[PDB]
């Protein structure tokens, strides 16, 4: 399942994840490709703030959904 | 006005323009521009991306768009074509990179010298603008952090005051090469379609297509060209469309299973609508010329020649941003995974001997696998005629040992050549009892014997019966992967099937006649 | 008694019957029934399916079954023909689809309105019968799931006891639209051949072909026509045969055909006619933007042929030249003048004669194929819309000049066609569906108002003074350079492999056997 | 009249029928009572497979007699 | 490469695959075509049940071979 | 002449320009002073969107005319 995360410049990167993944796992991936540690990562989907702990399937992250990354 | 959402892979501008442009082409309102150079360029780029676009024309463009009606289908078909055509309209790249670099230094020289990481730098200007997006998109580890190092290193000579005009001047003096290298890295970015895009970055193409991109309702009533209305909320592009949206979009479900990246690489051919036929004129082809063992010319082996053909297809495909052949090759042999740049770099007039040795080894392994799969398959019992076995290239090679002809038992060309066990077995054959035209009465049960063992009956060989672990047939088969095995067109046939390429074999004296064609 | 294995692509019944009927045809036992209506229909469908089935006779058909004697080759060339011919014996598809839909809702009323998925439904009856196989064959995303949604909607009006008869009457009252649409879909289902088949669905056909079908040895003692015995173990059809004829009429040639089941049934890839790998002609393209010495296609091809002739002369054979005179007698008794051709500076007189010959040959072939491709096939004109000549004709609608160059498109400057073309209500044209208007037009311009499209046959003579045939006569004329498309037909006729390099194709040499 | 149809499920079907009805007619009536399509139907009477087009009187099927229904396979 | 898969009613589906595909891959293709979750798919070649993670060439499943699909718990 | 460009933050830039210049040229000057890439720049004078190829004289921009600069959004 391919998810995209988008910065405030419009720049997007692609991540290969599963619905069972939690936001911690994602934040670690983002840290691998862009270097930002999960402390300073704040992810948002559908205007909801997303917290490390619940999973993609709980926030209803589907096949090619796009998340917002901010610091 | 209804709003159509576009997927957010980062090329949302190209997806949105793809959707709106599709509505405009299907509506008929752009037929007058069919002949204009912009839309001829569009049909050309479309053809370069989709090999099954046979009648390369407006009618079949409309046919594809009406067929692949779903908007995601449309994006996969057309957003890479539009992304490709846009590159043909980039004038100021040099100025663009230089300016992005002066932005990066001028707002973070302090941060650059203090060892700040890339995510810590200021990438946004006072107006909300993005300061250096093209650089921003490059890989952090391979390019961005080393960029910070090279910049800190160069900045020792910066003894003027920290002003933008200063930084620009200094950079044109002391970072000439740095800028050159970065221009190469940006124009080669494998994920450039995912960095953000503003409307005006497409202007040269939109102008050439007689189309105005209208952003967030900010219209210019003086502009009377046909308009694609775009909507940007939260750094994402969507399409407005008026009666039209229902008429030309999402009438059918999504037919393509393709990732954005695979589409831009053109990894799998989009299949043409059923009303059209394949030309196959332009199917990828390898063109070879037999020289004889007596007069070998430069004496290349079959795998060398074939590998050169593949490499040529690779580079030619890179010309229009497709990595099709290469990604197929990696599909067949993971060890090729990281040689795309090394393959594009290969000089075909003096090719790099070691990398070519690697590709030849790959080809020998691929054809070994395919050849033995074909062996097992061909040995499944169908008929007492064994019509598939006695035609199997490798079985014919095995049988060539019987006729003793030295031309058909060359170690360079026949993997079974000097199989001591096989030749013993065939020394124990009453050849008087063997009448001409019936040698296979003995050779077929012998072969199967050596392949699966005396125990099993030829009539019972299915796809599950495993070859003898000790089978001398398999070990003679293993020579295909050996340097001293030159190979023949026989071995290259399996490769033609594996890389989905058309193999053409000139004879040494075959003539070629030129002619004008469309 | 040995079991011959049929490809399990869903048409295993048609594959098995193709194999058994094949041994019967070559075996001679059906030479009595051969002139009957059923085998005349079989022949007609065979020629309808294979544009290169050149002489329409059984002589040729037995040739084909002998040359393409691999069992998979047999399935590939005959199973689509048997499928087509079987369609000519179906009678009441309306009632069939009604019964299938009522079965669906009868056994899945609650299932459907509960929002279940298709795979979760009951598709089999108490005796093991398939409840709705044709419906089941339709694509899930396109048709099946939407149908479950529509049935969910109209089932809100079902205010009756849940019985099969009540469901039938309900669907007659409330689903006439749905039933009509489903009829269109199922009748045009391009994967219909994969939906699995029972013997009696072919009964009509088999009776017209005088053959009984024996299922798992359960023979009818009362039945006494020639039989084809079929084993069905795990929902798959294989054909039993005696060892003796097994070895004489099956698998007595190598496998020759490289093509998928779907490609065979659809007609995308034509099969080549039996021959009695080949010589090769090698050409390289040039562009109009950048020509070489400006040679036309027919010139290049003729030079290739002459090289093949001279080569065969060195080995003291005239095979190719013989094949040429059988195509055009005007060339017989030119052997020596051709052999004496200085290919550095070839004689212009003779070469223009040879090119003329080639142009007429390619016309004969293109017109034969076009006539095969206008034959009525129950509404399907995909083979016709793929025809190179129809593509050249339809290129005039949206008139891009590159597709209307007079040297390459025979229809380029035909005023009557350009008239009818420009006088079409383009608003009535559905975008991407221009064919809907273009293929009737074409048919008209080829056969006139004199013959209804649905009546066109392999024999229907095209109307004379037709603008189509007038335009194609341009390929006989000498201002027509031709394209690789025409050279494909020439490659058909002379039995050569045509290889066309691009302007920039590289050639690597290797040492070979 | 009335005839009976027994199959391997142990269930027996009751059909209202006239001796001029054809085997095709009987199969259609079974498809009306049960869901089973006639192309998967074999009807047997007195160890003889009944062919479509011939009538019930052609086989002496008379009031209150019984036929065997057997599934014809598909593949 | 074309593979076939046959259901209990005899209906057959055409899959496009490569020898290196895992059984999980083929089950995902079947999900795409017929909607069955892979946990409810049971594939059998010639009497042998197929295991996820093993590849199509581990069972020597070649072009135009036919697998048998059955529903499970 | 010396003109100004104003921002929706009220911020103004002063630009030395000549009437023969192009709007593309003025955008290049704005980039040299402030850093805004011309691809993210929109210039409005007297309620009109300014085209890259035309000239300040074409729109009658005079000395100490005020232009307005708005951010073209990225996405």
Residue numbers in the entry:
A (entry chain F): 1 to 71
B (entry chain B): 2 to 243, 245 to 520
C (entry chain A): 2 to 277, 284 to 520
D (entry chain C), F (entry chain E): 1 to 75
E (entry chain D): 1 to 73
The publication says:
In this study, we determined the crystal structure of LotA1-542 in complex with Ub at 2.64 Å resolution. Two LotA molecules and a total of four Ub moieties are present in the crystal asymmetric unit. The structure reveals that both DUB1 (1–267 aa) and DUB2 (287–542 aa) exhibit a classical papain-like fold like typical OTU DUBs. Notably, in the complex structure, DUB1 domain binds two Ub moieties within a cleft formed between the two subdomains of DUB1, whereas no Ub was observed to be bound to the DUB2 domain despite its ability to react with Ub-PA like other cysteine-dependent DUBs. Like in other cysteine-dependent DUBs, the C-terminal tail of the distal Ub is inserted into the catalytic cleft of the DUB1 domain and forms an isopeptide bond with the catalytic cysteine C13. The second Ubn (colored yellow) is instead bound within another DUB1 domain pocket of considerable size (over 800 Å2). The C-terminal tail of the second Ub is exposed to solvent, that is, it is remote from the catalytic cleft and no isopeptide bond is formed between them. We therefore conclude that this pocket corresponds to the proximal Ub-binding site S1’, which provides a plausible explanation for the presence of a Ub band in the results of the size-exclusion chromatography with LotA1-542–Ub-PA in Fig. S1A. Our structure clearly shows that K6 of the proximal Ub is oriented toward the center of the DUB1 catalytic triad C13, H237, and D10, whereas all other lysine residues are distant from the catalytic center. Of note, the conformation of the LotA DUB1-bound K6-linked diUb adopts an extended conformation that lacks Ub-Ub interchain interactions.
LotA is unique among other OTU DUBs because it possesses two distinct DUB domains and exclusively exhibits catalytic activity against K6-linked diUb and polyUb chains. Full-length LotA consists of two DUB domains and a C-terminal PI3P-binding domain connected to the remainder of the protein via a disordered region.
